[model samples]
Target chain A: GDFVLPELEDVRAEAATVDTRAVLALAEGEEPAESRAAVALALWEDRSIGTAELQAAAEARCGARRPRLHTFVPLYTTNYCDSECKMCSMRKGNHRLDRKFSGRKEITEQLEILYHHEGVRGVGFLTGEYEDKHTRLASAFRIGWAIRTALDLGFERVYFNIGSMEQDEIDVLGEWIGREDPVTMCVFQESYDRETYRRFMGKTSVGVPKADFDRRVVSFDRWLDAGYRYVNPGVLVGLHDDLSAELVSLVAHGDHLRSRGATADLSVPRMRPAMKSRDTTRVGDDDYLRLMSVVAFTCPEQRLVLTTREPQEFQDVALGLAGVISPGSPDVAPYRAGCEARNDEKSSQFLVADLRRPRHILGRIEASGTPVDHFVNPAGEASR
Target chain B: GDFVLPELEDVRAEAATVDTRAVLALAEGEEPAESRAAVALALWEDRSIGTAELQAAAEARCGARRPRLHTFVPLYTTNYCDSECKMCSMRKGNHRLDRKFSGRKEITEQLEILYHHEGVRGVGFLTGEYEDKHTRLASAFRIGWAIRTALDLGFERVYFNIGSMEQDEIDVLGEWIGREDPVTMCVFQESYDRETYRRFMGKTSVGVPKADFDRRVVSFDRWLDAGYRYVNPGVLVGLHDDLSAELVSLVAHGDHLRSRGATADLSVPRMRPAMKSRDTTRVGDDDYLRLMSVVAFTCPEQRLVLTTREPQEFQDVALGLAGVISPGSPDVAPYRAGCEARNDEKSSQFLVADLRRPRHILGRIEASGTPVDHFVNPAGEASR
Candidate 1:
């Protein structure tokens, strides 16, 4: 109901002229009359453009200004996902995985360390899909309470992530929550391929909320309609082989969101080697870097983030093309155990390849020709 | 005529396809057949490609490795000149210029500090034109002795820059000098517009060596034939309003040098603001950067350099698109005076904008995501 995706014919029409020279022009920043989505698609079709030019252009576009990445901690508040998505360790069909939740006491303890010791001002409160009318109601309240608690305890921006929720559920949290804390809804629509999306996040035992791809796609509008101010959407790369089409669709959706006056951060959480997920399609490191180069070129003005799922080697190069970076661990409980002892999973979601501390991440950012800052706003965003 | 010059028809033909898309492909590294000269020329016609994509592409081509800049000291051992180039403070016509030469004692004293204190392994010995048949012979022997003296003192490479020399003069310097010292001949052609070139560097009188642009153009071959290894050529940016055509000819000339089994470096020492220079056309910061981006995109494999004429701010951004950089000031006599006091001009040719020491330049290089090294070889050139 919210994001107006272009008709399939229109999307394919955009990718029609994938002439190497034509596509290369789009990569070099030519304005193709309101057809940037098409440019993204065509750019993907052409690979003769190497990493150095893309990187140099991306950096040169930023001019002399070195953007400081927005610093934040990701708290996997609960792994009790009720929906089943094929390429996730937390898929409800998998009984081999451990289930856990950060109790209010557990969350506050983690928040204290992040706020006091780690100097983390922003937070990403993540949870898996929640189903059942009764269970969903409790989740909305619990999540809203956690958001308010973090703000009261001194967090600047509290990003909320969960499965798609109803208007009532969105209101239960939003009616009191976003009075302008810059709390964005972090609901990612994994793929633009309708078939690929449903095939993975498809009918899982019937009552699952994430199974409804239509609802998840427009969930941003639902939250904003309820009182939220921002939405950060992403594509879980490798959902389908041709990501250029997916990018075109993603850019189209982002344009629609911008038309509706929204603030957004584009994150491409690549298909990390998921545990126990049987034979998933993977986006190789080369393809992934090219994917980021497109993002850096086409929508450079938007905040681009590289998750900790990638290691330092990848981060160092991609950092040239990205502005916001997620350096904190998703497995907070084990990290919490390091402070004392907190019971949680041996692995959280997908394994994190970059296990470096905040200090090293900051060091690397500066070494990449950018000055680092934790208390400031990221490139395009305005602060409260 | 060892280095062939393509007919003007060829260069104009290369720049013929200035259509934004086609040019963009050229900028994105599409092999314009064997005509990269056209790519460089056409790439300049299109500024629709911003600095970011250009810089990004330049960085990505290097893959994961960052090429360390070759570190060296530029010793302006003399202000003596026989030709009058309108743009230099050292033009022989300017009697106001303090003409002096660094005796062997001053040269060795300056060399010791650069070798011991600054850890500089490379040296660029520069002088103005020497024309009297007797004077030219003494100058050649003196310069050749300095090259051998520097190699014996532990300098790895000595790049020599002076006026055009005869076959006998070139042999006096090269017959025993570059047995394999990697001592390159640093003769910059200033401009390629035959008329614009003659206008700036043409004869003030009959016996001027620099007025013979044709002989100077082929001097690289003469040196190589006599046993010297590498030749670095550059376009003095302000010499002509159209560097695009200049670049076309420059690339054509560079191609010919490469065809002759020559190892070469391309340095575009921009038109810096010079003292006592007549009204001259100058490339703006945007044009200069675009020029560098073209160099980064077209000839990235060739060592690209930014001299001290640019400040650190420009260097920091261009560092992404460049691999080699010159950090030492041209006024080595004063720098030598810093250890005590020496007599020299208050200003050297043009002026040095980036007065930062080698430590700061190295620090900034690493800050730009590339590690800095002094002993190691720079990107494409092999170490001897």
Candidate 2:
């Protein structure tokens, strides 16, 4: 109800030729016209002109910059959830899944491994929402403690993917983050379609107030107002019938953040088929790539993050349009416990489609003539 | 045996006027004359003309350059050491100390913490030498595994300081490192003075062959020939009465590495008082600064690393002459176990004198008008 989507046919009819100049201007940090964003999304299906031109435009605007490859490793802090989202394997009451919550030390260890050994400068501390108020409070305390630990250990960028939290909890986090712009608050809308969101996140396990769609929707605003410099909004693609509408809204939110003078990123994680629930709306490779291009064209300046939901081969095609990537290593609790065998994909919140090393993905991106916009050197030297 | 030190008085007597031109040439990757390096060292002691000119010359030559201000977090992989070096607390048979060797998971976790959470892109994997051949082999295997883990996770630089190892063991490490040039192999010759070296490193716990001073000295050569591109040779500054001679040899090794078409770095760590041992000879801040300037002038293109052994104020002074620093964290084992209390500095190899956070040190360095030639952004973009 919040965002209106133009008819796909009308968006397509006007797109005889894309204005390469207009698309390139987005790279120069110029805001794109809403009509242009819609046209880009509509023309995304026209492979001959759409894919080729968008790719060229993105590269000219964003590619081959020194060390353009940006990468972040995910730290699944706790798998317990209050919200029973339909797509997530970690959704509450999923008895098939195991629950694990690592303490500050274990989480710190995971951070060290990613920072010291892996050369990862970016971190996403993730946790499922907690039903128990005390547990949720503890998770908040744990995230704050973990952020301090991360700062102490030398991590430069830490992003939080803790589910939508209360205002007081956000205030506590804001106090801890202080004046430093190191932390990026990530709260994925999951699905912007009100009814779809209501269907999945309408009820928390214990009826926590985040069960309301509007409350969750306004969190991005709350977080930004609470002094977060960067906020990432995302959609779980394939959840809604019209993925294009979700793409438009996701890009629009990024624009909204820019409008408010708050920096933003767009993460488009397609629904990965879960073990316990096979009811996910599958977003095929071609469809996901098209959706990514739409976001890329719509919000050229905002980082378009593509994670491990798609296979490596498809990720390469999508990488051309993406600003950031995460080489997947799902929750470490099972890996640490040795309860799950080596290379077992089952322990993750959702199955990872691309299990290759981050460097491998980076190598592939570079091989494709798109220089990663990330720090490739250990000394943090940009690859010129 | 290849390097001989000149008398301090003779070196000083010849230095009438400083050759800023020749000293500046070293920054351009040009080789300097042996006499010139000696003059620089001697002049480094001449505080009236030495430090001010040298610091200015270094800034003009290498400041704001890519790959400056390289920083590495120390990962003490194991304190179970075979080396009975007189100055070390982690030395074998130090019953007063705790011994722990972190497993692959723990080391990986520590790397994650440093890489993912702390914006630490560089790592120094350190361990005391293992006495048992199998244990040593295991340590080597674990280090290789950890390096792969680091590269996979996104760490750009991985350095090894697992004490001197056998030639075959070095080959095994070389094989693991493959073609990566970012990983530096660090081995310190506590003192180049024959008697001082012998006094400290003379006896291994079980009289292993690494105890031989000559064998230890030649390992830098072995490491280079075995396919390691970067090798770091250092001196434990306080061990010898004449610090100038150690400075001379340390600079000479950088020359030696360049001669072999291999890169090298100079690290001069002064002895810190250990819990079990306190026989270390002390070098005051002036002497250490003099040594650092000597190296900086002699090899302006080479990296001179400073650690937390010095006070914060002194580290700031030393940071001017040094290109790299290690904000030290001693043990990954106990820290991983959560057994030790938080912020306890006791778990380290030696007590850390500058216990400031990496960001604090980075800020102070920046405050000195030298932009951190390091990764200031999580995206690995260099701070201009």
Candidate 3:
């Protein structure tokens, strides 16, 4: 089989086989709580919950009214990534990626331009795995400086999504340990199934850390250990066909982190047409709304993320359900000198679909009667 | 000395001197209902009110909550003309106006194009006076057919702004006496002062109705007496200075018509640049807002209009204070074959200051949480 799907019977049988506690208690004690009446004698108990039910429940649970919408811009800090994920243009050995670095100098320059945008509340720094020297983890330092620079420029929040790193590498984040403003870090598991994971994320530059799945699975805790105010856990939806199994695992992971005393901001970014990435499953709009609604139900206290990968029309409809939306960039080199923004498949990780106008979505948030908490860095060029 | 300024103190002096009402009513009256307790005895009392006060009051008096914003397209259906209003581009002697007839066929063809626009609700037929065959009033026939056709295509409302006409001309509208949809007729007096009136609107094509100011002032009643559901009365600001005087007189005229038991929808459009038109005073945005606020105060029961002669940034601010917006056209010939849209002053009544997009303003109305009742035909083009 080319993809993964969970066997419902296997899960049911496993639950039934887990009666060792009942057998031990059967000899020793009686249950204390009174039994609530049920048709357990001949129950076909799992009658299948509809997506509409999830949507209705999600709507009611969302702050008991319209959700507050916020906006941000994603700045890919560098393309000097050393990983061989088959679905990502940033995969190591993809010669088409323009391997440029966005250091303190270039990232700050972009922030100055972004600071002038009308309604954006914050900026996000994104990068793939890289270390400047054998000893220095380059992304951590770059992300650190990027966060400090954006805060100095009056962006209300900063978000970073980087590749997995060890505990020692994230220790470089100590400079932000006691700072007051909000900062968030996100990591998306492209797929949770081992076969799907190996199929897409098979290779890496020699000695890079993305080679270990178990280590990568537990990598998010390191950023929480160091001082990210919030942890955003996301999943790339179209990496496999069985969306329910993927989302179930994703929600469980988010809850696990929240249980560890860290705030969780959940993201479920849908796949868009990407440069040289292998073919993936399609997630149409109706199913996307249903999937998003289901997540909303599972994580009532967490913020749901909306991505600019969608067109503006649908984004308007999604505004009532989402708490934040990201207008992300495909490449950051265009923010640098001597390099211009490009649309070629060789240059972009993925072309933007809602390339309508700068700050178009930000204005819509306020227009929809949802109070916006803060602005993000604007995606297009700022008017000088 | 060049612009008009009303002598307000003089008005109070005359009112006091003409209390012949006191001479007559003094003998017969007990002086009405406890005076509603005005400190009239010591009324140094006509205390000056600030713009901020008017703006605040307008916000509250507007339907007790948010105003309903609706959209429309202004089709200068036929440019054929016989008037010499200096501020308008379609004056008889201005050779630059591309005078083309939008007959039943041309109108229906354009409606077919506009029907595809997302939220546009209606189309307005506007023209300067032209009588075909030297015997029949042409605009009435054109506008009549225009209304019937637009309604046929599913537009929810129809509006027309045309030159002054005889009772006989409007009588032609008697055929559609009970068409269940809305049809509104509007007439805007570019200025209410005779001095300002003559300075601009001093000429007309031989034997035209606009030649008589008094008849033109009364022309609106003829449309109402015939079967139009609503009458829109308006003034073009910048025709003179002392906006308060112009607005006071305009509001009084509106109230007078309402006494005749008619629904008044008022427009106070600020002047924009026009081709070869005489220089006019400027009414910048702040003063314009205050002046509009005053009209909102005087005509609490009437609907106020917002125009596209403003930039998009400010339009969003004005959205809270008015009902309905006209994304008007400078020329409609572009909507036809063998002719393309032109932006030159010679071909336009005035260039649109907010030249952003066709439906940009319409979408912003809904964005501002104002319920848009009907959509106007989108200006520019309707996507096929």
Candidate 4:
């Protein structure tokens, strides 16, 4: 297969400049060499792939064996969100499952299930941002309460990946987490795009364009320097922006976070609708793969996480590059009933991409030749 | 009552000449105000009672609040030693108790009993010091292991109150404890008399005099500033000069510690015969009472601890002025049995002074109008 210089320059300059439309066209046609080459080029550029030079560099600093992946589980707090994301199954106004938000009991049951059933060592208090005029306390405190309880219960690693939050809110949350002393509370600035953020996000004050910018640029440094050790950053896929620009933003964001002394993590999540809002986008498989490749190459030391929003095949393929996955993630907690069940249903932010049980996910991860790690050791804190 | 001073200059000097034989005879005989006042004036002139004014100063600096009694249990590692100390239970050749040294399981049981049965929030690790033998990996590593396990199991505090050691070893242990997150590791100097320390303690490379001095004068500052929060200092009774002079030294020591940013804990441990050393001069009840008075008044903020070495009546009396009282203590630990049984052993450092159980001790403190705060919040590190 012959490659053009203009295409190489586009790949090198933007790192991930391939149009998903073109990649989609190639997937349909008999000739797939060009798209494969594009994917290979993206992988080659990814230092995380550790293509020879990266491995040598890493070997020089840390020796031969790469640090193991830190296992983490998601703690679903509430599914009731205000926005109507187009690509997600938990779209607003869908009225599918009995919408619910958990009080202390269901939250405890959900945590116990994650701990006992999945043998999960760590958890993230996950919830969707609700913009309804009547929603009580914001997702931060509710998830913060869960984090406090988890830490008191002697869990070593616990964090929150709820949504984008203001620097002040993060400051308060970071201090609260530090006082409790379990692990870091992590929040995601879903995407770095202003237009995509405004379009996909509803009336939520947390993840606006300026807020995301501040988090992506400044607040990330603020929390990291303030003694918050573990941080996870990711771009929202399938929402807006061409893949190339999104990759550039993510790479630059990662670099900025590293420079800021923050513990770095990179994950890609697509918008999953909760309640009703026009903000929506369903990311195609090609774009997701390309985006993962871009992220893997940009920051190999930083873990690249694919949530349940992505398909099983896509998630399985992502494992070769990214180390961890949220397997057996359910749209609603399996143990609770009644208004409690409705609470979990209503508070969910996104639809589950991989619908397998936890055992099934572990089995798949093990079968895939990639070792699945569940505990977060001290060594893993700085590595991934 | 008229008292004649040998010289006015000698009254204020650091060292004073005392007629102990005459005073001893008078203390046992019937005495009226004139003779008692003459003796009291002479004692005051020795600068021990003269320095009672400093008590108010300490109170002012520490603020007019009563000191807190932090109740803690001991985790005895080994009933063994290399040093031929005059005041230890487990001597080199002779020993007391059944002589059981706890390993992992025993340590676990001890911690469980302390945490569950007694509700002890912190523990102190104590053992005999045998120069080269005690610092072995088995002893040091086990101490490290115990601390780590304690922190992991949700114990809020852990401290070391064994004997002295070299600076580098202390620093290593300090680093180990700091890493393990023990509240503090206290090596009580027992006394600040360099000459007396040399006579009593077998000096290593950091000579006996130098080692005790180093551990007392500098090690705590280093440990505290190096990230250890709590520290304790005390004067062993019957080791040196009369109660008056020793009281002055005690005050000076406490002041020095407070000046250097270390929290001062005043424990009046009297000389008692042990299996290890039989050459001990037991101080009388009157001397012990005077010492307790000096401790309570001079460094009121310094928690005045009365351990089980004293008689039950003495302990009851001291509890009125003292902040902490060890009603029951054991010098040996049985790995499987638990800390409660350990406290009940017949062959301890001394007979249980207050043989009243933990509940009775708690009741006594309450009845004495003193709130027995069992736990002291761990403070920040002190500078060496």
Candidate 5:
């Protein structure tokens, strides 16, 4: 709390006078720690510069050399979990949802369609946590095999959004995928506040792998230790009390990754109402935009991923702030294969507001006067 | 000449009073003839507004629903020509130029590289006209085979930039290609001025297919007669004295296309310095921009193709004025596959000012705050 709460408040108060040189400096590949604070304050406090103006600045900063945003498909390999987390639809004890796991053959078929028919260049595999240590290691091997299949099938990049693992497990996973192509692992810390994290994700029973908050917080370091260069760190927006502070903290987390010889990107995803959790305190579109804008102003070079959990309208506006998106519906094939009856409704983890096909979303993006790229790794390689 | 010379001169004088609504109306799928004229006048007259303002208007009109510009790769299958045109490097009289014809194997290999490696979607084939009827028909069949091959390989659009053909010939060509995918045929009216046309492309000692100006002018209608919906009509600037009038006339030609069932698109390609004719007149960057601006203001919805013959610096500015580009070097592998080493220098049609690769041009385009697409058809389908 030494450099967290009061410094964030300073960003809100002196935002109007916040110098943007610090943010622009990041775009030029310069790192000035103080400028990050200045940008955060400016974005939090300044309402004088409208959304369009901010977007224009973002556009200039991002440039047109790459696709304004790259699209990645989320393939949930399995829907089983050990964690009793309250916010997730895939919590271990939630019996209200149906579960499914895609085999390697099914994943290969889906990858073929995505690559040849749909022109998808990137894919991310999502799965739930396993309880036993043996099962967890086996799950890592299963995901590693799937990634190698995608790489062999000509996918430019493959990402993993599975739960955190041990350093040895990560090392084994890295060995399977190899270094020819980069791998990005997205692990969101649902809340930056320790108290909020304990309330929602605290262990409800024995053998829950997600019970340790400190371990999860430092898992990114473990990933870097295992030689993954591109790691995306983010926070679920609605879980924390102060959205602005959480966003600032998210930027700080990115700075921390940079300090450890890894590049950082952020995702600003809101909590969607799941089957069991009918009531939630989620940020609206305006708050999402504001928080995203603040991050943009603070880290102009930071690549942000806006998920389809947000509405199409909000996602359109978010395009100006973020440079990457996972815009596909999670209920579709590969996530749930060979299910004839309502596969999406049965297998969907969280409801998606923008369930439009990747091409339709791409068309909308192209129409918005920005290009949509399938593979643009934020680390200046083809790792997206 | 009722709406020709007098009305064109009026456009220059009343440029400031030009109505942009008519231009924007075209974007909303409106076809108001008078408004097109008004936009033309406004662009011709208004030196008051700079390129930036016109670009802003273009951005607003183009919106974000479509890719800002689509990429087209020029493939010259055969360099053998009977045309004695004064400006082209492939003109008949140049003995220094090497001649070669790319068979199906070479074309397929090049297209493979283009599609898999370079991400090319739209391809335009360029070839010199054969004098004899049998040779001409055979040439058409060879190109039709190439187009079919590209379509089989999953290219979204294939275009032909060959010289004019008869109604029967176009009909056979269309039937062979089929209508499931649209094929665009780009035939430039090298000069609208009869005297200028006769002076440079007069019947040489040997017969030239391009010498017939009336046939070239009516060739677009012949294409429509053969059920070709996407027809690109262009003019070679610097062949005439009045660049503005020629540009206005180019708008009139597009308007004429809209009158028929076919949709209209324009390409204003300037004369690049040729190997044989180093002293030929050519449009400077400023003049080209002014002419393109006039066309853009007049036909806001019109998809204009700016070739790589223009400088990169000029093309960067031209991004705002045009929505499609033929930005590859004419001497490259795909364009000059069968020619011997340094074929681009030997069989090259015209020297390109922007010698960078297509991807590099695309990078600049994206950097200029515009999106680059590989598949955008001007006739509202898979036609480039």
Candidate 6:
């Protein structure tokens, strides 16, 4: 017991999480065929599985060698929206900050600046809702152009963080990006409550009668059928009263979607205060860390996207425990201006705490003897 | 005592052979040099200097690992020459066989066949002596084509074995082959005495003047000076009264040539009667085998060539003792048809005393755990 350092909360909280008797009882809960997968997944993410289990899993995943910390920049093409969610900083009418748009030239210049950094291996393209023609069509075209251009210029990986859309849009985007390549699209459902969504969301408030969570959920499902292999869908943490309800619901949804041949990746980021829109009652560091550990341990094979909303320090410590982290992201404003700030600006969606230079971060990771893969390039393609 | 196989010639006389001390002695003698360049070549061949003697020499020479196996294919281009030679079947005015010429396709095809074979770590483009422009000029172009084709096909090492050319001709060939990719040209001096050379070769009867053995002795020197890195020139065994004289002469010649900016390789082939060649009233099998032991033990760094001129069984026994052996070769009529017959027609030069397939011969060598290289892609290329 003394072998583990007490600085790790999960290690310190193991007794309360699950006792040996309880573990045996849970093992007994599985009978015949059906429940073992559930049991194994549950045990995998169980906090009581402890440091030894984590190390064993890490060893199996990336060899006994620890994985290296990876860093990448984000490319936000436009902030205009068709339907704004209450929690998003770029919500229409409620938005306090000015919106922006990047044409083809501007986007290329932005990426060029991003790629010159030694550790920036990829760029993620993010946008608000893009279904209403006026702003949406221009941004959609730009998305297709950006992805194709990134590939032509030989970026290791490119991802789209725009919200959910129809199958036609998905098919068009898939063809532009290369069908053989994995297209990354993250769409959070925010909450499962239909009435709450109807009362708060911009589309519902603007007299559109499609006030259903399941309707939005079906778009995510369609995204899968249209060959969007990596779908990042998760519940907005700290929203529901019962955390287990959210966890169990998302886990079931993941299993159901996977059974129907949809490979969904869950990106679990806790809500934090932003200048335009905020969730003041943020999940604490310990809770959020536990949330990630649970999510990771539960779905060991799932690719977890740990955003820069958290501090870089957490990401470094979580290197063996987490799948991904952003390392060399320049503040979008000055990065666009060709002179960038060293510190995380408050102007970003949330404050970023880890301020170590990208190179230094990489050096520390290499010194630790962990292998870091910058991005998942398509198999057989050279990252360069 | 049980490990010592009698010698290459002695082994040729019988069906079975066993020897280790003689083999180790041979491997030791083949050790490169005490200088950095020599040691580098030696380790380049050996991979590691595990023995204290070798390690000390390697350190002294600052020798690093070098992957320097050169590849070349025989032209099978010439078989008839107007020389009443004791060792050769095609004597003066002896015209009993058809001449063969391999155009670019055939030559490149043979090289491709060799490339697919294991242990083919290198090859040498060998042809009998050229008497006139038809044979000499065509052989030159073929050599150029073979070397270039090999380089184009990703073969690392290529060289020539065109016999008895003048200083200017060798210089031109050396520069031409070097242009392809730094190939070394090799020529062997059958003996060092003009009187013995003339008597045994019947050179006095032919209108051509007798060869100056002293002049032939410096062929390696000239080739070395002509920018060829590897120089192979050695005596024909069983021709001279004292076979020991051949070994001693080689040692002196190699040491002197190396001192005078030449990297010398000594080749020793015992006489096996050809179809039309006069019965050699020469050295016995035991005497010839003992001479091989002496040659291998005396000058370890020199390259030893064991052609199929010896029976396969004898070649097998000699391969471990000698540093290198010929693998893919077929006989050409008149002078060399006996060689091709032994390979293709299963006939022998003096009854193949030991008849075994090339694979079986190689298998025996491997069974004894002796290292072998059949291609120029030999390992230990780290230094290069």
Q: Which parts of model 4 have CA positions greater than 4 angstroms off?
A: A1-384, B1-11, B14-68, B95-98, B133-138, B151-157, B165-182, B203-217, B334-347, B375-384
lDDT of 6 by residue, A1-384 (tens): 001111223322432343332433322122223222243334445556564444444324432222334445566665545555556555554445454444444567767665654345666787666433212332443466578777676677677766655664565355466555655676666654444454445344342222335546666667666655566667777555444435545555565566666655666666655443434346665555545555554455555566555676666555565565554332333253334323333223334455454445555665677545664322234324
* Candidate 2 chain A, run of 10 with poorest lDDT: A334-343
Candidate number with the higher DockQ (2 or 3) = 2
Interface root-mean-square deviation, candidate 4: 23.8
lDDT of 2 by residue, B1-384 (tens): 232444555655555455645545554555545465466665565655555566666555555445667888778766666667777777665777655545444566777666544556777888777553434544565566567667777777878888776776675455456765588888888787777877776654455544767667777777767766788888888778877667766766677677787777788888776754547776776666656766776676778888877788777566767777777556544333222212333455777676655545665666666565433433345322
Error of 4 at A325 (Å): 32
Expressed as tens digits, the lDDT of each residue in A1-384 for candidate 3 is 111233444434533443322322321123212111011100112225455554564655575533366667778765656566767787766876665544334566677655564445577887776422211232454466567667877888788777765665566443533434588867777777667877777744455546556667666777666555577877788887876566656666776677677777788787777654578888887777777776665466677888777878878767556778776567764443223334456656677677543355565665666666675334346334
lDDT of 1 by residue, A333-372 (tens): 4444224223224446777777665545665575656665
Candidate 3 global CA lDDT score: 0.60
What are the lDDT scores of the predictions, listed in order?
A: 0.68, 0.65, 0.60, 0.52, 0.66, 0.49
| After superposition, candidate 3 runs with Cα above 4 Å error | A1-384, B1-48, B65-67, B131-136, B176-180, B203-208, B333-344, B376-384
Query: Poorest 10 consecutive residues of model 3 chain B by lDDT?
Result: B34-43
Q: Residue-wise lDDT of candidate 6 within B20-108, one digit each (tens)? A: 23223333225422322222222223323233343233222222212111223333533434345655543434454443434333455
For model 1, residues B75-188, the per-residue Cα lDDT tens digits are 777776777788887787786776555655567887876665555678788877755443454456557767887989988878888777678677656533655776888888
Write down the TM-score of every candidate.
0.46, 0.46, 0.43, 0.41, 0.45, 0.41
User: Model 5: chain B TM-score vs. truth?
Assistant: 0.84
What DockQ does each prediction reach against the true complex? 0.00, 0.01, 0.00, 0.01, 0.00, 0.00
Looking at candidate 4, what TM-score does chain B attain? 0.72
| lDDT for each residue of candidate 3 in B78-120, tens digit (9 for 90 to 100) | 5656667777787777877755544344566777655564345
- Regions of candidate 1 where Cα sits further than 4 Å from its true position: A1-384, B17-31, B62-66, B337-347, B375-384
Best by lDDT: 1
What TM-score does model 6 achieve against the real structure? 0.41
Q: Decide which is better by TM-score, 5 or 6.
A: 5
Per-prediction TM-score, chain A only?
0.87, 0.83, 0.79, 0.68, 0.85, 0.74
